[PDB]
Each structure stands twice: as C-alpha cells, then as structure tokens.
Amino acid sequence: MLALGIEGTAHTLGIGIVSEDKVLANVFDTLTTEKGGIHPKEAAEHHARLMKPLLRKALSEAGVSLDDIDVIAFSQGPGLGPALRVVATAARALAVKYRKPIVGVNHCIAHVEITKMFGVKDPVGLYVSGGNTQVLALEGGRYRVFGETLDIGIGNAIDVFARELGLGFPGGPKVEKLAEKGEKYIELPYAVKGMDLSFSGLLTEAIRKYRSGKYRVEDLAYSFQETAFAALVEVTERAVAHTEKDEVVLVGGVAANNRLREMLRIMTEDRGIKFFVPPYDLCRDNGAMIAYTGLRMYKAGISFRLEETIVKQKFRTDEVEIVWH
Ligand SMILES: Nc1ncnc2c1ncn2[C@@H]1O[C@H](COP(=O)(O)OP(=O)(O)NP(=O)(O)O)[C@@H](O)[C@H]1O
Ligand SMILES: [Mg+2]
C-alpha cells in the first residue's frame, strides 16, 4: 500500500510517499529564517506557495500518480496555526479530488513511529527539535510523555545561544563545532526540573557568562552541551528504567548532534539495551514520517470524517490511542 504525507507544523514543508516497508519519496523546502525566530504567517505563505512544486517533485521521485495513493495523511498538530491550516486544507483538497481517505497525524508521535519501518518494536523515544523536547513511550495503549520541556525546546535554546554568539540559524551545528574545541567545563545550572526539562535558566546563565568576557566561547559552548544533554539522557534513562523497554530512539532535528548520540550510546550500552537513530532526513521535520504513521493508522481501520480533520494547535501526545500496535 501507498500513503502520501504532508508535514508543515513549523517552517518546513515536507511531502513523503511511503509503503509499509520503504520510503519512495521524501522532499523538503524550509522557510529561510536567517535571524531565527518563529514566523507563523510567513511559514503559511511559504507552504501554500511551495505545495504544488513539492507535490510534483515527490510524485516524480516516487514514480507514482495520486491515483496510486491509498491514503492521504497530514500533520494535524501540534504546531503553528496558520501553517497547520494550509497543510490540512491542501490534504483535504487532494482527498476530495482523488476520492481518497484522509488521516490526521500527531507530529510528535510520527517522529517516533517512523523508526518502526527499520525494525524498532517498542522504544523509549527522545524527541528533540527547535520547539519540542519530549521523552515518550507506549504505556496503557497511548504514548505517555514522561518528561518534556517546561519552557523552550533544546534546539531553540541552542539557537538563541548561537544568535548571541554571532552564529546564525541554524545554531545547533555551529554550537556543536565550537563545543568540540572546548577544553574546560564551566559550571552551569542543571536542566532537570522534577521529571521535566527546563533550559531557560541554563541559557540565560550561559549568556551572562558570555557577556562577562571572562571565558572562552568554545568552553561555554562545550559546557552548554554537556549540561543540557546530560539532562536529556537522565530523563530518557528514567523512562527506560520504569517502562523496562529494551530500545531507545533519538529523533527530531537535534538528533544530528554527535555528542548527544555518543552520550546516549554510552547510557544504552551500560544498560545492555539497543539504540537507534534513523537517517537524518527522517529525523528532522519531514513528510515521510507523516505518511508512514498515517498508513499504519489507515491499515488499523482509521479514516477521518471532515470535522475530525480540523487542526489541533495544542495536540497532546497522549490523546491518540495507538491501536495499530
Ligand atoms: N548538530 C546539531 N546539534 C544541535 N542541534 C541541531 C543540530 N542540527 C540541527 N539542530 C537543531 O534542530 C532544529 C531544527 O530541526 P527541524 O526538525 O529541522 O525543525 P523544527 O522546526 O525544529 N522541528 P519541530 O520543532 O519538531 O517542528 C534547530 O533548532 C537546529 O538548531
Ligand atoms: Mg524535528
């Protein structure tokens, strides 16, 4: 079977075409934000403009027509209202025109679910991006969020720090490079708050220390990563300990980070459990993960009525019953 998926919760418009076993197409266009920040209205304009060209490119690279597609899937939420609405409108339009069933997909769930195409069965997921940071795992028939950010996503925290230092968007790779050159740990506030993550205190302290001129920038970048990532690993490990699951996945745009990967490898190896990171075009915001999750939902008998396709800006991860597992 084939599914077409449209992702557009934030600045990236992604269209994917997948089967149960493989990705046939995975195409991208991201709104250029040279000075970072969140731009919901510009993202919406971008998605609407790029919808037709990207759909054409996805169909060409997959080598199929829209008549070959079994189900249309879209990122229903959570995310930016104007951007979500463009995506949902486009998906509904395709569904009506080609008389296809439609499914709304939770963006956070999709990030974890895509790993199951690669043989992952039942993982603790660490989902880390610009605006999102969640540790999630299947419990009681739903994805339970064990810990999440109370303020800003780790990606955004790094992006703000980068901007302060004169490193333009995206900040992540640039801060990662600086961190590799660090040779001294500088004490910074720990980012675990109860079960959850909190990065605002860490970020503001790092900026204050930067403005003091007392430290090497590379040492601050190194310390920022060591502190923030150690927190991520702790929350992930706690979830593993409780759930007794034997695999961890790292997903989201921040999954590109080699240091974070290394820290998770160490933790999983010490526990004697598996660790997996999908190819990066399936880690960052993409349409293929939407297509795959949507297909699994459809095969489980899920098919949305029109009023069920209304966007959910604050879509909670635990709302969806995972009946396809
Ligand atoms: N090597 C890296 N280390 C740390 N952060 C990174 C790295 N590469 C990318 N990032 C961050 O990942 C984020 C981009 O992720 P991407 O999924 O492309 O968009 P997004 O809007 O953050 N996704 P979402 O929040 O899930 O809608 C940015 O904050 C980047 O700085
Ligand atoms: Mg992402």
From Swiss-Prot:
Cofactor: Fe(2+)
Molecular function as annotated in GO: iron ion binding; N(6)-L-threonylcarbamoyladenine synthase activity; single-stranded RNA binding; tRNA binding
Effect seen on changing residue 127 to F: Loss of iron, but no change in DNA-binding
Cofactor binding description: Binds 1 Fe(2+) ion per subunit.
Chain sites annotated for binding substrate: 127-131, 159, 172, 176, 257
Amino-acid positions noted as binding Fe cation in the UniProt annotation, renumbered to this chain: 107, 111, 127, 285
Annotated catalysed reactions: L-threonylcarbamoyladenylate + adenosine(37) in tRNA = N(6)-L-threonylcarbamoyladenosine(37) in tRNA + AMP + H(+)
Enzyme Commission identifier(s): 2.3.1.234
Keyword set, alphabetical order: Acyltransferase, Cytoplasm, Iron, Metal-binding, Transferase, tRNA processing
CDD domains: ASKHA_NBD_Kae1_arch_bac
GO cellular component, one term: EKC/KEOPS complex
Location(s) in or outside the cell: Cytoplasm
Domain of life assignment: Archaea
Gene Ontology biological-process entries: tRNA threonylcarbamoyladenosine modification
Extra information: The ATP binding pocket identified in the crystal structure would actually engage the substrate TC-AMP.
Role: Required for the formation of a threonylcarbamoyl group on adenosine at position 37 (t(6)A37) in tRNAs that read codons beginning with adenine. Is a component of the KEOPS complex that is probably involved in the transfer of the threonylcarbamoyl moiety of threonylcarbamoyl-AMP (TC-AMP) to the N6 group of A37. Kae1 likely plays a direct catalytic role in this reaction, but requires other protein(s) of the complex to fulfill this activity. In vitro, binds tRNA, ssRNA, both single- and double-stranded DNA, and exhibits a low ATPase activity.
PANTHER family on file: TRNA N6-ADENOSINE THREONYLCARBAMOYLTRANSFERASE
Quaternary structure (record): Monomer. Component of the KEOPS complex that consists of Kae1, Bud32, Cgi121 and Pcc1; the whole complex dimerizes.
HAMAP family noted in UniProt: Kae1 (MF_01446)
Record-stated family: Belongs to the KAE1 / TsaD family.
Protein name as it appears in the record: tRNA N6-adenosine threonylcarbamoyltransferase
Gene behind this protein: kae1
